[PDB]
Amino acid sequence: QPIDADVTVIGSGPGGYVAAIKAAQLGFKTVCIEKNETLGGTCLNVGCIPSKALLNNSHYYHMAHGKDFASRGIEMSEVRLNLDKMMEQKSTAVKALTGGIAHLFKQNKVVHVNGYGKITGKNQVTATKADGGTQVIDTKNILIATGSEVTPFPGITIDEDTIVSSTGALSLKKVPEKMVVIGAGVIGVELGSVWQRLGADVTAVEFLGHVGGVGIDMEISKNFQRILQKQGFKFKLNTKVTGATKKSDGKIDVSIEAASGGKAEVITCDVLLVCIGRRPFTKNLGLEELGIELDPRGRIPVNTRFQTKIPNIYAIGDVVAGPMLAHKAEDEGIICVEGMAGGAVHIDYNCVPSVTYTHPEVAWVGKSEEQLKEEGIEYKVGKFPFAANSRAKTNADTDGMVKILGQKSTDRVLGAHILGPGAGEMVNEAALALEYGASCEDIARVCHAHPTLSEAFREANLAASFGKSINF
Amino acid sequence: ADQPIDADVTVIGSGPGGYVAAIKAAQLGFKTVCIEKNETLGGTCLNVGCIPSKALLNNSHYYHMAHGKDFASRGIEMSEVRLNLDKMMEQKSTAVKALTGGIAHLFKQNKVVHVNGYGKITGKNQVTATKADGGTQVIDTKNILIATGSEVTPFPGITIDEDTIVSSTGALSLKKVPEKMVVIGAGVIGVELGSVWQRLGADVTAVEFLGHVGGVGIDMEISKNFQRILQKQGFKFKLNTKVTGATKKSDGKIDVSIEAASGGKAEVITCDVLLVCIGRRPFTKNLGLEELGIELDPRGRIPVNTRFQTKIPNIYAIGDVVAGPMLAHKAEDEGIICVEGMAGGAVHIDYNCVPSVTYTHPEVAWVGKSEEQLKEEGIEYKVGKFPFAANSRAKTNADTDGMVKILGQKSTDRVLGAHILGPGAGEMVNEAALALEYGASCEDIARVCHAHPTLSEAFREANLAASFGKSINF
Ligand SMILES: Cc1cc2nc3c(=O)[nH]c(=O)nc-3n(C[C@H](O)[C@H](O)[C@H](O)COP(=O)(O)OP(=O)(O)OC[C@H]3O[C@@H](n4cnc5c(N)ncnc54)[C@H](O)[C@@H]3O)c2cc1C
Ligand SMILES: Cc1cc2nc3c(=O)[nH]c(=O)nc-3n(C[C@H](O)[C@H](O)[C@H](O)COP(=O)(O)OP(=O)(O)OC[C@H]3O[C@@H](n4cnc5c(N)ncnc54)[C@H](O)[C@@H]3O)c2cc1C
C-alpha cells in the first residue's frame, strides 16, 4: 500500500496545487495530499475566488440600484436582489475551478491523496483518511503547503451564524441591517463593502489609525478611507474591541473602547464579522518530532532555497514568512520545485503586488512613501489623478490617482501605488517594470494605447521623471 | 490685424498629436503656438473619435447586460429595463465637453497660445492663420509642426448628409435607434459602432471588401474567433462583398446595392441608416505645402525622415498626416519625440511596440506581429495559448470568452507577438507593449509574479505555454 515518490506536496492551495503541476511537468513523481474534500485550498474554496465574485455582483447591483445606470440612459423601474442567485453564481464558479484543479492533476499525472498528512520521518509522510485506512508515502523531498487559518479573537467565538469569520460572510443567507467588522484590512474592507452595497449599515473597527492593511501608502490609505466613507462605510479607527455579548433578540452588543482607553461605547449589530488576521497552519504535521522549530509568529523558517533545517524538506506558502498572498504561494511553489530540478531560487518580495478588489480598487507594488522615509532613500513623487485619464472620464469613473515613487538620483521606480478603477490589472504592469529594474523614464517613453486607464501609470511616471505630466 | 507674434514652435493642429506636442514643447522651454480651425480643441479623437465612441460602447455594454440574461443570472433582478437614448448621448457630450475644456486649461497652465483659425504656412519662419471673421494673425516661428490630422475617406458615389447617410460623426449622434443598419467597412470603427447599436436593438449588417474583420494587422485566428462571438451577439457580416451603390428611397430608407467581390451574388439590402467608414485619410488642404513645394505621397501622407522632418528642415509633421498606424497614441508619441528632438535628442519609435485596441466586448488588443506577418518574413515561431475559460478572474466574473495568443521565436524565445481577445484586453496589451519595448522573452514575462486573481494571469500563463510548452492552469 505505501507509495514511493520523488516530491510529496502536503496541500492543495495555490502553493501546493501549482507546485504539484509544475514538478510533475519537470519529470518528478509527485503526490499531492489534501485534507479537505475539494482541491484548491483557501483561495479557491473559502478565499479569493468567492469574495471577488460577490464583490463584482454587488458592485453591479450598486450601479443599477444607484444613480449610475440611470445616468447613462439605462432607466429601470424596479431593482431587486435575489441573494440566493447571487450566491449561486459564486457557487458555480468555485465548483468549476475546483474541478479544474482535479482535471489538471490527471492531465499532469499528479497523485491526489485525500487525507490528513503527517511527516512521520525525514523521508516519510503518513496521511490519515477519515475512514482510517492508512496511506504512507516515503519521498526524497517533502513540500509543506499546509497554508493558513483564521486568527481567533480573544473571547469571541465564531459560530458562523450570527458571529461569522471570513467563511461565514461568504455564505450568509440574509443581509444584516447593521454589521460590525473587526479588522480594517483587505479581507475586512472587501467583505464590508459587499454587504454595504447590499444595504447593510457597516461599521468597521480598527486598533490602528489607517485602512487597507499591510504596507499601504498613507496618502493612498487616507484617500481610500475618504471615498469609502462617502459610499456609506463607517470607520471606527484607533479603537480596541473590549468584548462581544450576544443578546436575547439575537443581536450582538460589541463593547468598544478607544486605543488609549478613555471613551467606551457599546454598539449593536445583526452580524459580527471577525477577520483580525490569519496565521500559518502547522497543526499535527510532525514538525516537533523532526525538530524543525517554528518562529514566534508560527511560520516555518526557511533559507533562500525554501528548504527547512532538514535539507530535503521544503516549505512554501502562507506557512512561511512573506506576504500571505496567493500569487506569492504560487511563485514560491514554482521556484521551489525548480530549485529541486537544479535551478537557482531568487524572489524579490518587493516585486510582489498587493491588491484590494473593492471599487475603487487599490493595488500597490514596491515600497510606500513611509518605508522609504525610514530607510533614508530620498525620492521624487509623481501623481496623476484618474480625473484626467480619458477612459476614466469616458466611463464616468473619475476616482483616485496613481502615485509613482522614484529615486531622486537614479530615477529607479521604487514604488507604485494605484487607487482607482482597474488598479488590480494595472499593478501587473508595474510588477513587470520593477522586476526589470526600470526607471520612471523607461515607463514614460513606452507607448500606452489611447484611451486606456494604464495611461495614468505612464503619465505619473512622467511626472516623476520629468516633473510635469502632459495631461495634468 | 494683430501684432505679429514671434514664437519658437508653431503647431498646426489640436489633435492628440498637436495638443500633446504643444504642451510638451512649451514645458521644454520653447515658445509654442497651437493653431486649431475648429472651435473645440481635441481633434478627431476627442470630438468625433475615440472618446465619444468609447463612451457609447461602455454605455451600450451596460445596457446589453441589464436588458439581457446576464444581470438576472447573477441575482440582479430588474422588471423594466428601458433605453433613454437622449441621456446616453448626454453623458457622451458631457465628457467631451469637459475634456475639451481640459485641453484649454492645460494650454493656459503651460503658457500655450491658442489661435483659432485655418492656418497657412506663409513662410519658412512664419505662419499666418485666417480666422472665421477674417482678421489675420501673423506668427513668426523657427519651426512649424504639421498635425493637421485626417478626414473621412468617402465611398465613391455615396454622399454623406449626416442624417440618413452618416459618417463616423453622424453615427455618434443618431437621434433614434435604426431598425436595420448597414455599415460600409468592417474595420475597428465599424465593428465598434455596429456593436453599439446592435446592442441597442438594431439589426446591424456590415459589408467588407476583404474576407476578414478587425481591420489591419489582426491575426487570422484572432479575427475569425472575434467574428464568431460577435455573430452570436447578433452581428451580421457580409464579407468578400463590394458595395456597387446606394439609393435613397421615397420612404426615406436606403437600399444598398450589393455584389460579391468575386462578382455575381448580387443583392439589394435595405436599412434605415447607412454608416460609411471604409477608411480615413490625411488632411493636407490649404496648408501652404504647394508654395514651399513639399510633395505628398501617393496615399496622401507627408513624407518624413526618422526625425519627422519634411523636405524643408524647420518644418516637421506628425500624426495621422504621416505614414504609420492611424492611432491616437501613435500621434501622441510622435508628437513628444518630435519636440524632444527639437530641443536636442534622438528620435526612435518602434511601431512593433505600438498596440492596437478594439474596444468592443469582447475586446481585441494586439501588439507586435501576427502569425501571418511572421510567415512572410521567414521568422519561425512558437505559439502559446491560454484560454480565458481557465483564467480565475474571468471564471469568477462569468466572462470566459476569448484567449491570449503569445508568439515566440523558435530559438531566441523573444516575444514577437502578443494577441489578446477577451475581457480587459485593452489594458492588458500595455503590459505586452512594455515587454516588447524592453525586448523581453517569453521566459522573462512568465517568471514575473502576476497578482491572483487577475485577467493578466492569462498573459503570464500564455508566455509560459510558449517558453516551457505547458501552462500551469491549462
Ligand atoms: C477571505 C479571503 C480573501 C482573500 N483574498 C485574497 C486576494 O484577493 N488575493 C490574494 O492574493 N490572496 C487572497 N487571500 C489569501 C489566499 O487565500 C492565501 O494566501 C492562499 O490560500 C495561500 O495558499 P497556500 O498555498 O499557502 O495554501 P492554503 O490554501 O492556504 O492551504 C490550505 C490547504 O492545505 C490543506 N492542508 C493543510 N494542512 C494539511 C494537512 N496536514 N494534510 C493535508 N492537507 C492539508 C487544506 O486541506 C487546504 O486544501 C484571501 C484569503 C481570504 C481568507
Ligand atoms: C470613430 C473613431 C474612433 C476612433 N477610436 C480610436 C481608438 O479607440 N483608439 C485610437 O488609438 N484611435 C482611435 N481613433 C483614431 C484617432 O481619432 C486619430 O488617430 C487621432 O485623432 C489622430 O490625431 P492627430 O494628432 O493626427 O490629429 P487629429 O485629431 O486627426 O486632427 C488634428 C486637428 O487639426 C485640425 N486642423 C487640420 N488642418 C488644420 C489647419 N490648416 N489649420 C488649423 N487646424 C487644422 C483639425 O480640424 C483637427 O481638429 C478613432 C477615430 C474615429 C473617427
Residue numbers in the entry:
A (entry chain B): 3 to 474
B (entry chain A): 1 to 474
Extract from the study:
The disease-causing I358T mutation was found earlier to quite significantly reduce the specific forward and reverse LADH activities as well as the ROS-generating activity of hLADH (in the reverse catalytic direction); the respective residual specific activities were of similar magnitudes (41, 30 and 53%, respectively). According to the domain structure of hLADH, the residue Ile358 belongs to the dimer interface domain. The residue Ile358 is also in the close spatial vicinity of the isoalloxazine ring of the FAD prosthetic group. According to the I358T-hLADH crystal structure, the Ile358 to Thr358 substitution led to no significant structural alterations in the hLADH structure. Neither any considerable displacement in the neighboring peptide Cys449′-His452′, nor any significant changes in the active site could be observed. Near the mutation site, the dislocation of the His329 and Tyr359 side chains could be observed; the hydroxyl group of the residue Tyr359 moved closer to the carbonyl oxygen of the residue His452 (catalytic base). In I358T-hLADH, the His329(ND1)-FAD(O2) distance increased to ~3.6 Å; the weaker interaction might have affected the binding affinity and/or redox potential of the FAD, potentially contributing to the observed reduced enzyme activities. In the H+/H2O channel, the residue Glu332 could be modeled in a conformation that pointed away from the active site.
Dihydrolipoamide dehydrogenase (LADH, E3) is a mitochondrial flavoenzyme operating as one of the components of the α-keto acid dehydrogenase multienzyme complexes (the pyruvate dehydrogenase (PDH), the α-ketoglutarate dehydrogenase (KGDH), the α-ketoadipate dehydrogenase (KADH), and the branched chain α-keto acid dehydrogenase (BCKDH) complexes (c)) and the glycine cleavage system. The LADH reaction is governed by the ping-pong bi–bi mechanism, which is structurally supported by two separate substrate-binding sites; the dihydrolipoamide substrate is oxidized on the si face, while the NAD+ co-substrate is reduced on the re face of the isoalloxazine ring of the FAD prosthetic group.
